[PDB]
Design a protein around this ligand. Structure first.
Ligand SMILES: [Mg+2]
Ligand SMILES: [Mg+2]
Ligand SMILES: [Mg+2]
Ligand SMILES: [Mg+2]
Ligand SMILES: [Mg+2]
Ligand SMILES: [Mg+2]
Ligand SMILES: [Mg+2]
Ligand SMILES: [Mg+2]
Ligand SMILES: [Mg+2]
Ligand SMILES: [Mg+2]
Ligand SMILES: [Mg+2]
Ligand SMILES: [Mg+2]
Ligand SMILES: [Mg+2]
Ligand SMILES: [Mg+2]
Ligand SMILES: [Mg+2]
Ligand SMILES: [Mg+2]
Ligand SMILES: [Mg+2]
Ligand SMILES: [Mg+2]
Ligand SMILES: [Mg+2]
Ligand SMILES: [Mg+2]
Ligand SMILES: [Mg+2]
Lengths: 99, 110, 103, 101, 132, 129
RNA sequence: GAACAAUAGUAAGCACAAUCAUAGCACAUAAAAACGUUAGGUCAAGGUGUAGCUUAUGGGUUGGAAAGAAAUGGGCUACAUUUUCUACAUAAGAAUAUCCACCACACGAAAGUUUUUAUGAAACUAAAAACCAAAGGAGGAUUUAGCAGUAAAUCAAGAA
């Protein structure tokens, strides 16, 4: 090692646009901190779930508008029909417990 | 295939320049070796610049050729500390001012 | 009405709905008109700051970081260094109390 | 309707973690620096501590997209093994085949 | 016994398409693939989104075309445009068929914000590879 | 077909390398026949090789709840073809790669590396600072 | 409900077999493995039949857990000379449980205690040093696994 080596390295450093003045290994993290995309910002993170409200509401609309057809919702519906026709329904809010 | 065309790996620009095709001086050429370092392959004389840091590839191209021009312009500038050069820093063994020289002169003295 | 599949493709492409060939992944994104020396060299916004202080150590690491970053344009980097000016000058008391006079 | 209340709170954790993200990055820039004073770091400490803890990165949990299963999730497809296997076996998943060697 | 995606042996009368008559372990041996896209290759991205897209396209095509869908839906993805290929039974008159063709192409191009192309091939009765 | 000639000195390529990735072999074989026969007509003078295949294998638990002695093993194979073109122009490049790219199959992906020939930059020519 | 110098059996279907995969063969392994059995497992992957909850068996915030007197299954590391250290990759040098007052050392601390460092808003986590060097001296009834590139030993990689 030499002073010629230190000055050569500083030359390369300030030239290439890398870290110029000697720093700790610890502080260097902050370098890498702005050198990247932060974790919570990445599209592979915040865009993880497709919007469920979108598909759900869209297809339900398209259904009542008579375009899409949901056999699951028809099963459900028909079964709550035969559940309430029996007399066991879903109580109007506030009524069930105390009465 | 898919809705989006944006590819992260696109941006990377490489430059490969043979140092034999450059107008460099002895001093300029070897100060450049010591300056650039790892980007230099010593057997085939190929210099490689990988540029990333900018979003658009035009920018990685202009900054890579920028690095080229910059290293060439500062390879010819001799400064104060280059006269401070350690003999251990040498890529060569110069017969001048050597230890083998003083061993020879002492052996011939005796 | 359509005369051929090629007419289909042609119209989709004029409309900008079909993709552009031979594909460059950068098609449709101009990056604000910027060039590298607006990205790489951040000296412009390091003008106002104490020069020999450790604040330049911290801000040179911040700078060298925002330089290496393809993921952000000019604007947001500048907002970073500006928020840093605003916050560093926000507390005048801390900097002076710490044992170094800081501007 | 998101398939669970689980996926509800975690989605709100994705929005939030995107929102205070800049604050996080810039505060933790000073907080993790050695050269700067310890005094700016105690105050930066109270600062990221003050942020709502629903906006921090690590409070976020990776779940299967459709079936919400918290664990056994394949990172690349965001899908639980039950659903993955289901999809790939019908051949609805491209390129995925049964391994013999 | 391995129950993944299989059709059990009946009294021997159960009509079966070539598709459901082959166990998962046959995929790429005999069976082809239902969906085709770049995403699962060695160096590539966003397989997940092409998968979500696939799933919803299954749901959509089976709910939009009640009772007439013959065999499982073939998804192609090429140069950002999706070619949706469906083998469909003859039930409804051509009017409603083109209505729903245009309807689907429009709504799918516009939701997925990318050009969609729909190919329907009509078949007299469900194709039977085995039994019957 | 509108054609126009700009006075500017069109870009040269020493080696235009095209990587074609796939799952299946057959499609890449046929596509190879296609690119070869397309690059012969335009007198582009090309070669083709097969870069060795890469196989990824990962494992899932076979049952919904608990048997850990039982595992399903799933596989993804990526096969390669590489077209190597030498000594081509910029326009010849844009056309050939347009024709090759528009027709690219659905299961296959394509990665192109172009090594383009530049003489020297201006501030470097023969000044010294 | 079969006998091949054949006595009432013929039968497409589905297993096994055959082909595929292990980049050529052959083998091996991998895969495949019907019908049924064990009301075997899972309503916490998800979806639902039946019953229930609806100012609550619902939805949010905040803090709190996972302590060992034991008992045991599975592992890892050993108990040392086919060993231990450093060089190192496959000829080397030294150490070596009893001399004895060693200024203790031979193996064996993965455990503890200190200080760091990784990550993180939050160290209870993980890694590395220094110290410490304990049980352990090949283990009762009784048992696991393996027929070849296997066992055993040594090394790396990936998944989250
Ligand atoms: Mg977590
Ligand atoms: Mg089994
Ligand atoms: Mg074979
Ligand atoms: Mg065999
Ligand atoms: Mg087997
Ligand atoms: Mg078999
Ligand atoms: Mg068998
Ligand atoms: Mg039971
Ligand atoms: Mg349930
Ligand atoms: Mg129910
Ligand atoms: Mg509750
Ligand atoms: Mg809590
Ligand atoms: Mg015991
Ligand atoms: Mg072992
Ligand atoms: Mg052992
Ligand atoms: Mg020896
Ligand atoms: Mg220890
Ligand atoms: Mg000891
Ligand atoms: Mg002892
Ligand atoms: Mg025994
Ligand atoms: Mg073994």
């Amino acid at each position: 090692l030499s002073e010629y080596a230190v000055r050569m390295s500083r030359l390369s450093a300030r030239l290439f646009g890398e870290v110029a003045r000697p720093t700790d290994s610890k502080s260097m993290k902050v370098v890498k901190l702005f050198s990247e995309q932060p974790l919570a910002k990445r599209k592979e993170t915040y865009d993880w779930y497709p919007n469920h409200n979108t598909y759900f509401a869209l297809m339900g609309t398209l259904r009542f508008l008579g375009l899409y057809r949901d056999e699951h919702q028809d099963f459900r519906d028909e079964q709550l029909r035969l559940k309430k026709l029996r007399g066991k329904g879903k109580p109007r809010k506030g009524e069930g417990k105390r009465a | 295939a898919g809705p989006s065309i944006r590819n992260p790996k696109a941006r990377v620009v490489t430059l490969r320049v043979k140092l034999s095709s450059l107008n460099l001086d002895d001093h300029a050429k070897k100060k450049l070796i010591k300056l650039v370092g790892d980007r230099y392959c010593k057997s085939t004389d190929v210099l490689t610049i990988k540029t990333d840091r900018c979003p658009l590839k035009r920018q990685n191209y202009d900054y890579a050729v920028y690095l080229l021009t910059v290293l060439y312009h500062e390879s010819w500038k001799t400064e104060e500390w280059e006269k401070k050069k350690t003999e251990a820093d040498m890529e060569e063994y110069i017969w001048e001012n050597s230890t083998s020289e003083k061993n020879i002169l002492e052996t011939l003295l005796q | 009405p359509f005369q051929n599949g090629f007419e289909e493709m042609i119209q989709w492409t004029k409309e900008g709905k079909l993709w552009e060939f031979p594909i460059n992944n950068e098609a449709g994104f101009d990056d604000d008109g910027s060039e590298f020396h607006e990205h790489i060299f951040l000296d412009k916004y390091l003008q106002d700051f104490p020069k020999q202080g450790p604040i330049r150590h911290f801000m040179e690491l911040v700078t060298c970081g925002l330089s290496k970053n393809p993921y952000l344009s000019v604007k947001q980097k500048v907002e970073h260094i500006e928020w840093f000016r605003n916050y560093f000058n926000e507390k005048r008391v801390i900097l002076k109390e710490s044992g170094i006079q800081l501007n | 309707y998101y398939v669970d209340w689980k996926m509800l709170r975690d989605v709100k954790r994705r929005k939030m973690a995107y929102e205070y993200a800049d604050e996080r990055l810039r505060i933790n820039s000073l907080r993790k620096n050695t050269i700067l004073p310890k005094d700016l770091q105690e105050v930066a400490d109270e600062e990221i501590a003050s942020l709502p803890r629903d906006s921090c990165p690590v409070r976020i949990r990776n779940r299967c997209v459709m079936t919400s299963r918290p664990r056994g999730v394949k990172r690349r497809w965001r899908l639980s093994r039950i659903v993955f296997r289901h999809l790939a076996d019908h051949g609805q998943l491209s390129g995925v085949q049964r391994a013999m060697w | 016994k391995n129950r993944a995606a299989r059709v059990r042996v009946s009294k021997g009368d159960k009509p079966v398409t070539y598709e459901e008559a082959h166990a998962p372990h046959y995929i790429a041996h005999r069976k082809g693939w239902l969906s085709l896209h770049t995403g699962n290759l060695d160096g590539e991205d966003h397989a997940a989104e092409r998968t979500v897209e696939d799933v919803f396209l299954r749901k959509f095509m089976l709910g939009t075309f009640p009772g007439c869908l013959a065999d499982q839906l073939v998804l192609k993805r090429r140069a950002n445009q999706l070619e949706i290929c469906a083998l469909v039974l003859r039930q409804l008159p051509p009017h409603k068929f083109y209505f729903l063709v245009g309807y689907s192409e429009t709504l799918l191009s516009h939701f997925y914000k990318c050009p969609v192309h729909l190919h329907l091939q009509t078949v007299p009765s469900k194709v039977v590879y085995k039994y019957i | 077909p509108e054609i126009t000639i700009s006075d500017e000195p069109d870009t040269l390529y020493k080696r235009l390398s095209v990587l074609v990735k796939g799952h299946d072999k057959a499609v890449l074989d046929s596509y190879e026949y296609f690119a070869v026969l397309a690059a012969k007509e335009l007198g582009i003078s090309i070669k083709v090789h097969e870069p060795p295949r890469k196989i990824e294998r990962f494992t899932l638990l076979k049952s919904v709840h608990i048997f850990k002695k039982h595992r399903v093993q799933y596989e993804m194979r990526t096969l390669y073809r590489c077209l190597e073109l030498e000594h081509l122009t910029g326009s010849t490049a844009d056309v050939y790669l347009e024709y090759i790219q528009r027709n690219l199959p659905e299961g296959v992906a394509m990665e192109v590396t172009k090594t383009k020939l530049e003489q020297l930059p201006e501030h470097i020519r023969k000044p010294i600072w």
